[PDB]
Amino acid sequence: NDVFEHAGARDVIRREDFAKTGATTMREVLNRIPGVSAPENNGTGSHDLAMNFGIRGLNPRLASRSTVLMDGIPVPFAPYGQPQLSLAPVSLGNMDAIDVVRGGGAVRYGPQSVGGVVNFVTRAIPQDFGIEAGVEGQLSPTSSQNNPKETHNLMVGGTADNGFGTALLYSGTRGSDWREHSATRIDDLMLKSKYAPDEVHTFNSLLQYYDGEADMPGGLSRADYDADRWQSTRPYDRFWGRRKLASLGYQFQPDSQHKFNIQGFYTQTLRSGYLEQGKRITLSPRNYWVRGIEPRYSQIFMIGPSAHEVGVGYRYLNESTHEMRYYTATSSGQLPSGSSPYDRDTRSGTEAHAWYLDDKIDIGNWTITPGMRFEHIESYQNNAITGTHEEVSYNAPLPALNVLYHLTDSWNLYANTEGSFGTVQYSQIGKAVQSGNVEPEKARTWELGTRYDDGALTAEMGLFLINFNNQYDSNQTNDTVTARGKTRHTGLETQARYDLGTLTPTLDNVSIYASYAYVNAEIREKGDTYGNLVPFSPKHKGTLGVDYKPGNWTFNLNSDFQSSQFADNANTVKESADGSTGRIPGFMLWGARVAYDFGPQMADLNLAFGVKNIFDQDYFIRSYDDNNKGIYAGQPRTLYMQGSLKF
Ligand SMILES: [Fe+3]
Numbered sequence: 001n002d003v004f005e006h007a008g009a010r011d012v013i014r015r016e017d018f019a020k021t022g023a024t025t026m027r028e029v030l031n032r033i034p035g036v037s038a039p040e041n042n043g044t045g046s047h048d049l050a051m052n053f054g055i056r057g058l059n060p061r062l063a064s065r066s067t068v069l070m071d072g073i074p075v076p077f078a079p080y081g082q083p084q085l086s087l088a089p090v091s092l093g094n095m096d097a098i099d100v101v102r103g104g105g106a107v108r109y110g111p112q113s114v115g116g117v118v119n120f121v122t123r124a125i126p127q128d129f130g131i132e133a134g135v136e137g138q139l140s141p142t143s144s145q146n147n148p149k150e151t152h153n154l155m156v157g158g159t160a161d162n163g164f165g166t167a168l169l170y171s172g173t174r175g176s177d178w179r180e181h182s183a184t185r186i187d188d189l190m191l192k193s194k195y196a197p198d199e200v201h202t203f204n205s206l207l208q209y210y211d212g213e214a215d216m217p218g219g220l221s222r223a224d225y226d227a228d229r230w231q232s233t234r235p236y237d238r239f240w241g242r243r244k245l246a247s248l249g250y251q252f253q254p255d256s257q258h259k260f261n262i263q264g265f266y267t268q269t270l271r272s273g274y275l276e277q278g279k280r281i282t283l284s285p286r287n288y289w290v291r292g293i294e295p296r297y298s299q300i301f302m303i304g305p306s307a308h309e310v311g312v313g314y315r316y317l318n319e320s321t322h323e324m325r326y327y328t329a330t331s332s333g334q335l336p337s338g339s340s341p342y343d344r345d346t347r348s349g350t351e352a353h354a355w356y357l358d359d360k361i362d363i364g365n366w367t368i369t370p371g372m373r374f375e376h377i378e379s380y381q382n383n384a385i386t387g388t389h390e391e392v393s394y395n396a397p398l399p400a401l402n403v404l405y406h407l408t409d410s411w412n413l414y415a416n417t418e419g420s421f422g423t424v425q426y427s428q429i430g431k432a433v434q435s436g437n438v439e440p441e442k443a444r445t446w447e448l449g450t451r452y453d454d455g456a457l458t459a460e461m462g463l464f465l466i467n468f469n470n471q472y473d474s475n476q477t478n479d480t481v482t483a484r485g486k487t488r489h490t491g492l493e494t495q496a497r498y499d500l501g502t503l504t505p506t507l508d509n510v511s512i513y514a515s516y517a518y519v520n521a522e523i524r525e526k527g528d529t530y531g532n533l534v535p536f537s538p539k540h541k542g543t544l545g546v547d548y549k550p551g552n553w554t555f556n557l558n559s560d561f562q563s564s565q566f567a568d569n570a571n572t573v574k575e576s577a578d579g580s581t582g583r584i585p586g587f588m589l590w591g592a593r594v595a596y597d598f599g600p601q602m603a604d605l606n607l608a609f610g611v612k613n614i615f616d617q618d619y620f621i622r623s624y625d626d627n628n629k630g631i632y633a634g635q636p637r638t639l640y641m642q643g644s645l646k647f
């Protein structure tokens with residue numbers, strides 16, 4: 001059930017490898033992943049509350065092109081009507097591993113699978129008993145920002161012999177980054193319980209309390225950016241949010257031949273915040289309730305010279321929402337509040353029936369898994385100001401096929417093709433687009449590639465193909481859906497690791513690694529824009545580094561690097577003056593770190609000092625459509641420290 005045997009583009013990093021790069025936030029761990037692009041805070045998502053991610057040149061603003069899940073539960077506060085992770089109730093420190101799947105997904109996962117299926121694996125409940133705790137502090141000396149950024153995780157839990165267990169997972173953030181007006185406060189509280197009375201029945205549960213607020217720096221005009229890169233010309237922009245998650249799960253397994261699982265989940269999420277929208281400053285609260293019950297049965301049975309693992313599954317989901325918008329003339333110093341004019345009061349919703357079925361077939365050195373997923377989406381929006389009521393319902397057949405060939409006991413070949421569909425979001429109901437109407441978003445992906453492993457050389461490489469019927473943006477500034485039409489995403493994803501010790505003792509416990517990805521994202525639709533590279537899609541993006549482990553020491557050397565990219569569908573090459581429009585530099589950065597594991601016994605106490613961007617080279621990223629569009633100063637040389645304690 002673990003990757004090397006995946007008939008597709010897949011990568012999964014484990015906890016024991018987050019520290020490697022001084023990583024402390026989802027973003028940072030995913031950006032090492034090939035073909036994955038995860039920009040530093042910028043725009044609406046200008047804070048550590050939101051998550052920005054995208055693969056294969058797909059727009060990574062607020063991850064809306066993917067299916068991100070924590071323990072199978074959907075992270076979003078609408079996975080249908082508002083995929084955008086303005087708020088991302090999730091903390092790296094509470095996870096034991098990140099599983100990013102670019103292709104060949106069980107068709108258990110969807111609908112918006114086209115942009116990859118990212119699932120976060122919350123830390124395992126300890127066997128008998130335990131306590132882990134860790135921290136990391138970061139500083140950007142060369143910034144006018146002196147207060148540092150601390151983060152920390154705490155783990156307490158265990159399992160009584162009666163077959164019951166519980167873990168209290170905690171993760172939180174305090175501090176500001178290298179930009180003024182970035183003061184963040186995050187508190188992610190989780191209560192993970194499990195119950196295995198025997199060996200057939202098992203019950204699991206998950207309760208979560210994520211509360212958070214942050215000051216958004218936002219972008220800069222050029223004048224201001226050169227004047228002082230650290231400063232921020234957006235003093236009103238703020239963002240805060242809290243999520244409450246509850247999930248109950250039970251699995252019936254009488255033998256290793258059949259398996260029944262059923263998971264239910266409820267999550268209430270509220271996110272709102274201050275923002276400056278042209279001579280008006282707005283308070284925008286948005287609540288979301290999301291129910292979901294999901295049963296699925298599996299069975300293994302042989303047929304002729306073939307092994308069959310039929311997987312069946314269902315998922316009913318219900319998402320009701322409420323979003324309002326209070327506003328005030330910026331000319332005043334006054335920030336908006338309740339009892340203040342509101343120009344937007346609505347209630348949207350959706351009821352989605354999904355069905356999926358696949359059949360893993362084994363035969364010789366072949367594993368063919370022909371599957372199909374089907375969704376019946378019904379979404380409605382109710383404007384309380386206009387009174388106008390709208391509705392939507394589309395059916396989405398989703399064929400899928402995976403084939404894996406076993407060349408050797410250490411080399412596999414694979415190929416696949418799965419599809420997706422994005423139901424019209426509540427933010428697109430009034431389909432005011434130039435080419436008729438908005439959505440849906442139908443896409444298909446094709447992957448071809450190989451994976452190799454031999455205990456000294458571990459590598460992979462694959463080619464992909466993604467066809468998009470259309471793609472729409474947002475332009476929060478004016479509240480209008482700028483389209484893009486059809487696009488075709490093609491490229492190659494590769495990475496490798498090696499034990500430079502199996503060549504000579506002198507390099508014993510030395511390891512070098514590198515990943516790379518070439519991505520060609522282009523517009524294929526109608527007019528003026530045809531033939532253009534999609535915005536924010538470096539063609540070239542990868543990493544390279546080395547790991548040395550003499551005794552309990554750990555020495556990490558690594559570099560990041562990426563080509564240039566455009567901000568608009570126009571492909572404008574000259575900076576716009578506000579800083580939004582404009583080609584964007586590529587760059588290569590260098591980072592290192594030194595850690596020691598004080599007596600793997602004692603208290604597994606670990607310490608480590610590391611520098612980020614040793615050369616303090618300069619770079620930046622633009623935000624084009626967000627109300628705070630501008631130049632976002634790139635992370636400068638950062639000195640950080642980590643500390644782990646286990647009991
Ligand atoms: Fe927004």
Ligand SMILES: [Fe+3]
Pocket residue numbers: 427474476
């Ligand atoms: Fe908006």
